[PDB]
C-alpha cells in the first residue's frame, strides 16, 4: 500500500516559470482523487475527457504533472483550441487533450512589496508552438531587416518579459499557480489504479 506522493508537487515551496514548466512522472502507487476533488481551496476546476464526479476507479499506465505560474487574465488561455500569448509562445495543449487542470490563487506567497520580477514569459517568437513543446532559448529576436549581430538595439529585443507582481494589484494582475495532469494508456500492466 504505497500512497502517491502528491504532497511533493501540490505543496511544493517553489514553482517554475511558464516558459520553463516542470514535468514530473508518477507511477507505482495508489492515488485518491476524492481528497483533491473535495479540498474547497481551488478557484478553478474544469477539465475535459474524464468526468471528475467520482471516476477514480480507472487504471492508468502513468500520470504526468506540469506546474507553472501565470496571472489571472491568462488562466482562460490554458484550454484546447485557445489563442493568445501563452497559448502560442509558452504552453500549447492538443485538441484531443485527456487530463485535468487545477488552478488556485497564490497572492499571499508569490507577491512581493515593491515588485516581484523573477517571473518571466516569452513575448516574441518566429512561429507558434506545437503542443507539449518547451523552448528555453534566449536568442536575440530580429524584428526588422538589419541583423542583430548578437547585440540589442533598434528592431532587436530580448525575447523574455518579466511579470510585475505587487500586493496592491487587482485580481486580474495577481499570480496564480496552475497544475496540469495527464493520463497515459498503453498495452501495459497499468500498476497505477488507486482503488
Amino acid at each position, epitope marked *: 500500500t504505497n500512497l502517491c506522493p502528491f504532497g511533493e508537487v501540490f505543496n511544493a515551496t517553489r514553482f517554475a516559470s511558464v516558459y520553463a514548466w*516542470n*514535468r*514530473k*512522472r508518477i*507511477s*507505482n502507487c495508489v492515488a485518491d482523487y476524492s481528497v483533491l476533488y473535495n479540498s474547497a481551496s481551488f478557484s478553478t476546476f474544469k477539465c475535459y475527457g474524464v468526468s471528475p464526479t467520482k471516476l477514480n476507479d480507472l487504471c492508468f499506465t502513468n500520470v504526468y504533472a506540469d506546474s507553472f505560474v501565470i496571472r489571472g487574465d491568462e488562466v482562460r488561455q490554458i484550454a484546447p483550441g485557445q489563442t493568445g500569448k501563452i497559448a502560442d509562445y509558452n504552453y500549447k495543449l*492538443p485538441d484531443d487533450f485527456t487530463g485535468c487542470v487545477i488552478a488556485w490563487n497564490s497572492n499571499n506567497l508569490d507577491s512581493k512589496v515593491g515588485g516581484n520580477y523573477n517571473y518571466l514569459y516569452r513575448l516574441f517568437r518566429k512561429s507558434n508552438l*506545437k*503542443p*507539449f*513543446e*518547451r523552448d*528555453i532559448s534566449t536568442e536575440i529576436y530580429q524584428a526588422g531587416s538589419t541583423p542583430c549581430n548578437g547585440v540589442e538595439g533598434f528592431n532587436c529585443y530580448f525575447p523574455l518579459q518579466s511579470y510585475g507582481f505587487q500586493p496592491t494589484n487587482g485580481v486580474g494582475y495577481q499570480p496564480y499557480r496552475v497544475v496540469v495532469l495527464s493520463f*497515459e494508456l*498503453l*498495452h*501495459a*500492466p497499468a*500498476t497505477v489504479c488507486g482503488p
Partner: single-chain antibody
Amino acid sequence: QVQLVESGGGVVQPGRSLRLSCAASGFTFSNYGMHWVRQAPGKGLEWVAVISHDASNKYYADSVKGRFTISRDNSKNTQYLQMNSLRAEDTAVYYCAKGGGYSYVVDMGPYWGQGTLVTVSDIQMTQSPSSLSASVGDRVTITCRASQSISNYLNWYQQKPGKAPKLLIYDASNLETGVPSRFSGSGSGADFTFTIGSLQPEDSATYYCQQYDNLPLTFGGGTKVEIK
C-alpha cells in the same frame, strides 16, 4: 506487449549509402515519435537523432549532421533512417527507442530493440570510478557528476554483455517495477549517487548514468563490476 525490431543491417564499403528500418507494435505509433541510439563495440552509448510525432521537427547529433536523414511513415508503423557517406568509425550496434508523445522529444525509457550490427570495411557527465571490484558481500557506491544544474532529470541503466540496456533507477532515485529493493540512489542538483547493498553474484554488469534535461542527450562513462 510492446516490441521493437531492427532491419537493414549489413556490411558496406566506405563511400556508399545504407538504410535501416524499425517496426513498432503494442501502442499508437502515430503520435509518439522514436529515437535512435548506437553503441560502438567496446565503447559507450551515444544518441544519434530524434523525430517528432508529425515529422515537422527533426534533430541530429554533431557527428552525424549533414549526412543522416530520418523519415516517418504513419501508415505501416515503421521508421526509416538514411545514412550517406559512411566512414570507418560508423561500426556500431544501432537501437531504436521509444520517445515521449507529441512534441516532448526529451523523454526516453525502458523500451529498446534487439539491435542490428552495421560494419564498414552541451552538458557533460562524468562517472567515477571507471572500474570497481568487491567481495561477495561488500557495498558498492557510484558517483555521477554533472556539468550544470539538471534538477531531478537523471536515471541509471544496467547492461549485461550482449544485451540491451535495462532501466533500474529513474527520475532521481525512484524504483521501477520488477526491481529488488537492494538498488537505491540519492542526490539532486549536480551531485548524484548510486548505491548497492549486500552484493550478489548476479550483479556483475556495467552501469550508466544519463541526463534528459535538454535536447542533446549524453551518457556516462560506465563502471564495470566483477566479483573478486
